Ligand code: HEM
Ligand SMILES: [Ca+2]
């Protein structure tokens with residue numbers, strides 16, 4: 260039962276009212292979480308509305324962090340956009 264969002268739509272969620280990003284083709288709503296994120300707000304704000312896979316993977320987030328991330332998944336990138344965005 261995967262819920263899809265287009266890249267066009269995701270790009271709209273780029274601000275303090277609603278911040279989404281993409282990690283490995285999934286869509287995360289970090290609007291609230293970014294106020295708590297141990298890595299700070301601005302790394303996430305810079306990524307809002309787009310893919311942040313590379314950045315996320317480079318840090319070496321802990322297994323508890325990676326598990327926490329799953330709680331913010333709201334859907335996945337629409338199939339029509341999956342050539343634009345690397346998994
Ligand atoms: C939903 C996704 C995310 C969650 C739940 C999350 C969670 C956390 C947590 C709990 C830590 C503390 C260390 C650890 O446990 O690994 C952390 C640190 C960090 N995160 Fe994230 N993170 C997320 C996304 C990101 C993204 C997308 C970026 C980059 C654009 C990022 C950059 C950082 C950095 C730079 C730090 C290390 C801060 C330091 O101690 O210097 N995080 N994150
Ligand atoms: Ca805070």
Ligand SMILES: [Ca+2]
Pocket residue numbers: 294300
């Ligand atoms: Ca703030």
